[PDB]
Amino acid sequence: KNEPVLDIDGEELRAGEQYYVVSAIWGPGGGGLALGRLTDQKCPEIVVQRRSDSDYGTPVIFHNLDTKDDIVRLSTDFNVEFVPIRDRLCLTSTVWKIDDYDTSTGQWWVTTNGVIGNPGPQTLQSWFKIEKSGNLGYKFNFCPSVCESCVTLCSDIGRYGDDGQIRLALAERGWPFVFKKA
Amino acid sequence: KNEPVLDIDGEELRAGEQYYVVSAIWGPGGGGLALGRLTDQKCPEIVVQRRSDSDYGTPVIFHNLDTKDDIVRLSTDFNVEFVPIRDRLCLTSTVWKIDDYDTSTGQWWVTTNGVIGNPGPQTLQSWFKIEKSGNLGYKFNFCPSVCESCVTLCSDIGRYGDDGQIRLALAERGWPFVFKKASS
Amino acid sequence: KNEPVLDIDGEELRAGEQYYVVSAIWGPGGGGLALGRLTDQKCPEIVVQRRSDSDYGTPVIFHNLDTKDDIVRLSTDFNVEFVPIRDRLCLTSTVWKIDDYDTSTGQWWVTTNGVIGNPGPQTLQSWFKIEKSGNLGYKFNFCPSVCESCVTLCSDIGRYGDDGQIRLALAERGWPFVFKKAS
Amino acid sequence: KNEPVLDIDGEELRAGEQYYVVSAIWGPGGGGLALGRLTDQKCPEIVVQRRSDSDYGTPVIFHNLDTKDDIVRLSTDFNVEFVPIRDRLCLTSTVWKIDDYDTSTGQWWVTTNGVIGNPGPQTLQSWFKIEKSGNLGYKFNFCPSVCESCVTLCSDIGRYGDDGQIRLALAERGWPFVFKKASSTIKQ
């Protein structure tokens, strides 16, 4: 019932298809999202943004809450994952998930090894939404509705630098993105 | 019921036929309407006007409220759609529709991805009218009657600069146009 | 008369009013501009950017070329002075100025101890312009017209690291900022 | 009359459109072509190859011999022109050109300051061809047909090291490339 998210070609996003997720602000705003790696805890992989606006990163696939509905819609909990590939060293999933609080940085990082499906308290950290972000594009938001009695974080997803890389983390002012069919 | 809209050859406008929409004011008043886009937005396409009074732009097709009435009449809600070119580069529709208010410019833009048919609250932004704007020539007006209980904007459509281009937006005083059959 | 610059609230920028100068690109793009100090130089103070986009830094005040025009306009030389949020040590001004070339870094830094008014060759390095940065905010440009017979640099202003900090310096492509009323 | 060159999407190459020229061999085969400069000589710029296969280099634009043909075709003379995103560092052009013989290395380098159009003797060094490299790739080749009375070199173009960089030079065996549409931004 909510408005469909559209890709840059004006086509409604479909769960199951592959989309690049690319900053709506180019230049110093950067490029697309991709799996990255930390040197100490090399698994799971982390979510990073390419610095070059000509690099669209790695595509993601959306998994709707309601598997009867093919269309990705605003303000509707979904799971999102980078396109699964055998990693040369990780067996964790590529599904996005909110991490535990990082006292060394003040950040709630978007990481991987999330889970698909089974909405409820157990999977709370794997549910994301999309909101409009001005006229530019769309922002991710973590504010799940899947557990009505749970206390939850409720925040846009923004960008934060860490270890020389650009990571995704909860932030007050969400980062705007657009979607391009892969 | 209402009086028909006439093309520049004095023939009544027929729903379903292609017409260019050309400024009644030539010279600095520009040419015809066409599909355009913005720097920061490939899709949906926007409605623009050619600066050159010899470029009639892209033709449109009118879709009447009453599908049993063939004639485009004054002061009557219709949908209007640009004829799609094949190198489209957008999957949104070419149907005109009023945008959400643009806080960065104070404008209610005319854009596309409108909807044909289903008159009522869901499609309110897609219904336009034609009014007289002289002893000759016409103007577009957004004042839908398809949802009697809906609160609606009710305004002429003028032109307004954006992104180096000439767009259409709601305005107090409408910009005058005439209609040229595209077959001719 | 050129188009007025607007603050993020849509109001025309006014000469004499205090504005934070805040990066139009947030997150790692950082926050606002501030008076700073090099670790090895206490005076003059330099221009730095806060790394955190929640810190809008030190407000500036614009001083127009035309004393009778109160509106800050595009492509028009002005002086910019940091509101003096500082200790009493430096006797130098808080007015922005282009530095002499820095051979150790290859940079032409924005620093302070600039001069207000007296347009001409003597104050050439204290005159700045604002230009639109596409549709995302505004950029500073150093390309003064106060001395038509002078040879002058003509360049956008971008960011560059120095001393563990973020500084401003002449650059090919200007970095985008927005303006917030300090009040 | 010749078959059209295709980009990685399978679409015919279009004269005037921007393309990255990217090695058909990844990893140790490197990335795309770009404008470079020698350490000792700043102008004209030279043609170099990025060592990283994730760096597609500087986009080029093709200018056909036949200005009324929009399609870049096999075995058909064109000019190639780098389109840099930054300000120009030289007053020389960014059009590819075959250099004078380098007695210090034995190479005929691909350099720039070439010329667009005016096919014939004066511009002979600015005309290049694309030929098939097997069946999955393309190679560049210098063998211009624009001056029927001229004596000319006629050779594929390979990679060769110079100045700690990867350059292009005439060679027996041509290096394989593919062509990728270049987009200014995600919204274009």
Side-chain angles (χ1 to χ4, degrees):
Chain A
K1 87 185 168 33
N2 283 353
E3 181 188 338
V5 180
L6 316 176
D7 67 18
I8 62 160
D9 285 339
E11 184 161 34
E12 296 163 23
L13 262 49
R14 277 178 12 71
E17 310 281 320
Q18 302 188 13
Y19 300 95
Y20 297 105
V21 184
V22 188
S23 174
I25 297 164
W26 53 89
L33 310 181
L35 297 147
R37 256 192 254 281
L38 297 172
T39 75
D40 58 359
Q41 202 184 98
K42 291 191 259 182
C43 298
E45 287 176 278
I46 61 176
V47 184
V48 299
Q49 175 198 32
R50 301 290 195 231
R51 286 191 193 269
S52 172
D53 54 23
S54 53
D55 192 345
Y56 294 172
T58 302
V60 304
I61 296 172
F62 296 93
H63 297 265
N64 277 347
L65 197 65
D66 169 23
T67 82
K68 294 309 137 272
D69 184 7
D70 322 88
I71 307 277
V72 179
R73 296 164 190 296
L74 303 165
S75 295
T76 307
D77 282 326
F78 50 76
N79 315 125
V80 47
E81 70 177 335
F82 283 103
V83 166
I85 179 183
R86 75 156 139 262
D87 188 50
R88 45 180 268 264
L89 52 84
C90 296
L91 306 185
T92 42
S93 89
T94 58
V95 178
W96 296 15
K97 141 182 201 323
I98 299 301
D99 198 4
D100 299 311
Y101 187 61
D102 182 0
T103 59
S104 69
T105 62
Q107 305 297 306
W108 293 90
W109 298 118
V110 177
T111 187
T112 58
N113 205 33
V115 296
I116 290 156
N118 307 305
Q122 186 169 319
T123 62
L124 185 67
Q125 294 152 308
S126 286
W127 294 101
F128 295 85
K129 291 169 181 168
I130 288 165
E131 290 314 321
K132 288 206 259 213
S133 180
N135 59 283
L136 318 96
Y138 299 98
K139 58 172 173 193
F140 293 87
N141 174 269
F142 178 77
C143 191
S145 295
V146 301
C147 172
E148 261 334 289
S149 36
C150 288
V151 174
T152 181
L153 292 161
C154 186
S155 179
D156 293 343
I157 290 165
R159 304 186 313 146
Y160 202 70
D162 177 58
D163 163 69
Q165 291 173 94
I166 302 159
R167 289 190 70 190
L168 292 205
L170 298 183
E172 170 166 2
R173 185 181 180 180
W175 195 257
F177 291 100
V178 294
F179 306 102
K180 160 163 207 39
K181 274 174 307 253
Chain B
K1 206 97 62 75
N2 282 358
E3 155 184 359
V5 182
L6 314 169
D7 68 15
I8 57 164
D9 301 310
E11 286 338 316
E12 311 169 330
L13 262 51
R14 311 203 92 251
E17 313 289 305
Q18 307 196 4
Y19 299 89
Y20 299 103
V21 183
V22 185
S23 175
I25 310 193
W26 58 92
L33 301 181
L35 282 156
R37 47 154 303 163
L38 297 160
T39 288
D40 294 8
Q41 199 189 66
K42 197 191 334 303
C43 304
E45 301 140 302
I46 56 169
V47 179
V48 298
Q49 177 197 30
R50 301 290 193 230
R51 293 218 197 232
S52 163
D53 59 352
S54 58
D55 191 343
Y56 301 159
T58 320
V60 300
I61 295 178
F62 297 92
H63 296 270
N64 270 0
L65 194 45
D66 185 346
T67 37
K68 309 151 280 133
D69 181 20
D70 277 71
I71 312 296
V72 181
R73 312 186 180 282
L74 298 175
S75 268
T76 305
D77 282 328
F78 53 75
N79 312 127
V80 40
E81 167 183 22
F82 277 114
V83 185
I85 220 162
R86 180 66 190 186
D87 210 6
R88 290 249 344 112
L89 310 140
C90 287
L91 277 290
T92 40
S93 89
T94 54
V95 179
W96 296 14
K97 78 174 279 292
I98 300 304
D99 203 1
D100 304 311
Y101 183 67
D102 183 357
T103 61
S104 70
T105 63
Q107 302 306 304
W108 300 87
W109 297 117
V110 182
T111 190
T112 62
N113 202 31
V115 166
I116 290 155
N118 190 26
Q122 285 63 257
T123 64
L124 186 83
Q125 293 154 125
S126 287
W127 292 102
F128 293 83
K129 288 171 181 164
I130 290 170
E131 304 296 352
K132 288 174 145 143
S133 64
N135 309 87
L136 67 79
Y138 302 99
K139 64 181 165 167
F140 291 97
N141 175 266
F142 180 72
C143 192
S145 299
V146 293
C147 175
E148 284 300 271
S149 74
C150 288
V151 170
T152 181
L153 300 151
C154 187
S155 180
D156 291 347
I157 287 160
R159 58 169 191 173
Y160 201 83
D162 192 31
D163 183 43
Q165 300 184 68
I166 305 151
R167 292 191 70 183
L168 307 180
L170 300 189
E172 154 148 50
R173 262 177 271 261
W175 189 262
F177 294 101
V178 295
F179 307 103
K180 178 59 214 158
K181 189 118 181 163
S183 286
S184 274
Chain C
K1 282 295 227 284
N2 296 331
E3 175 182 335
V5 181
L6 314 177
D7 70 22
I8 63 193
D9 301 310
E11 298 286 50
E12 289 171 352
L13 275 204
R14 263 145 191 101
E17 187 89 56
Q18 304 188 11
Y19 300 93
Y20 295 103
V21 184
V22 181
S23 173
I25 293 167
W26 63 105
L33 307 178
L35 294 159
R37 282 176 170 147
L38 298 166
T39 64
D40 53 286
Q41 168 186 132
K42 248 192 184 200
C43 305
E45 301 139 305
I46 56 167
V47 183
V48 304
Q49 178 191 30
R50 306 288 193 221
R51 298 177 173 281
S52 167
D53 63 10
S54 70
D55 190 342
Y56 302 163
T58 313
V60 300
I61 293 155
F62 297 92
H63 297 267
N64 274 342
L65 191 41
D66 208 346
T67 324
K68 76 65 167 201
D69 186 8
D70 48 284
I71 304 305
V72 180
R73 289 150 198 300
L74 293 172
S75 303
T76 304
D77 289 329
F78 53 71
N79 314 122
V80 42
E81 160 207 0
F82 266 127
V83 173
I85 282 47
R86 55 186 195 164
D87 55 37
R88 306 277 145 164
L89 166 80
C90 293
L91 301 195
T92 52
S93 88
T94 58
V95 178
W96 293 12
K97 186 183 92 63
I98 295 307
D99 204 3
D100 301 310
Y101 181 71
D102 179 358
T103 60
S104 60
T105 62
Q107 300 306 306
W108 297 90
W109 299 115
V110 184
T111 191
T112 59
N113 206 32
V115 173
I116 299 174
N118 189 25
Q122 277 74 58
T123 57
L124 189 67
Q125 311 153 104
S126 294
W127 294 103
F128 294 82
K129 284 171 167 107
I130 285 162
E131 312 290 344
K132 261 177 133 209
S133 179
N135 288 298
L136 211 76
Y138 300 94
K139 60 187 183 175
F140 290 95
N141 174 266
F142 176 78
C143 187
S145 322
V146 297
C147 174
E148 79 167 62
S149 68
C150 290
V151 171
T152 175
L153 297 150
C154 187
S155 174
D156 287 357
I157 288 162
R159 334 174 288 151
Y160 203 85
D162 191 32
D163 189 42
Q165 310 181 67
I166 300 175
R167 290 190 71 180
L168 295 196
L170 302 184
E172 187 165 300
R173 291 177 128 61
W175 186 268
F177 294 97
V178 295
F179 305 102
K180 175 95 190 113
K181 200 162 249 86
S183 295
Chain D
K1 193 88 108 298
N2 264 235
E3 316 161 40
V5 178
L6 309 178
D7 67 18
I8 58 160
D9 294 325
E11 328 212 300
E12 303 173 344
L13 250 59
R14 271 201 92 80
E17 172 169 6
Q18 280 187 47
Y19 297 95
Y20 297 114
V21 180
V22 185
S23 180
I25 303 165
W26 309 334
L33 302 185
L35 278 183
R37 296 130 85 62
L38 292 169
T39 286
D40 285 327
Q41 172 181 355
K42 307 276 132 200
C43 301
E45 276 143 300
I46 57 164
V47 182
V48 307
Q49 186 201 11
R50 302 290 198 232
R51 309 190 166 269
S52 171
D53 69 358
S54 55
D55 186 347
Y56 289 175
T58 310
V60 304
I61 291 178
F62 298 97
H63 301 264
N64 277 339
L65 177 53
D66 178 4
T67 40
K68 324 151 261 284
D69 189 3
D70 301 280
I71 302 310
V72 183
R73 300 173 192 282
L74 288 169
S75 314
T76 305
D77 285 308
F78 52 72
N79 314 125
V80 204
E81 176 185 29
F82 274 125
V83 180
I85 49 196
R86 284 201 299 111
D87 288 342
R88 298 291 335 279
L89 308 155
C90 298
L91 292 186
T92 49
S93 89
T94 64
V95 176
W96 296 12
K97 183 183 89 80
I98 298 299
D99 202 352
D100 302 316
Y101 178 70
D102 178 0
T103 56
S104 74
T105 61
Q107 307 296 311
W108 300 87
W109 298 115
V110 185
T111 187
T112 62
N113 203 29
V115 179
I116 291 169
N118 184 26
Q122 282 57 252
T123 63
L124 182 72
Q125 289 152 314
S126 287
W127 294 99
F128 293 82
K129 292 172 172 165
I130 291 158
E131 309 279 357
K132 281 166 91 33
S133 189
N135 229 295
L136 320 153
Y138 294 110
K139 61 182 175 184
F140 283 96
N141 175 276
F142 177 76
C143 191
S145 300
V146 299
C147 175
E148 88 167 357
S149 58
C150 291
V151 175
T152 181
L153 293 161
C154 184
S155 182
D156 293 341
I157 295 183
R159 323 186 297 160
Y160 205 84
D162 191 25
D163 190 33
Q165 293 177 86
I166 303 184
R167 289 195 71 184
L168 308 179
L170 299 184
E172 172 71 347
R173 214 153 137 200
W175 187 264
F177 293 100
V178 292
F179 304 97
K180 302 183 181 223
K181 281 174 199 102
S183 309
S184 49
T185 84
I186 182 60
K187 310 253 200 160
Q188 280 80 292

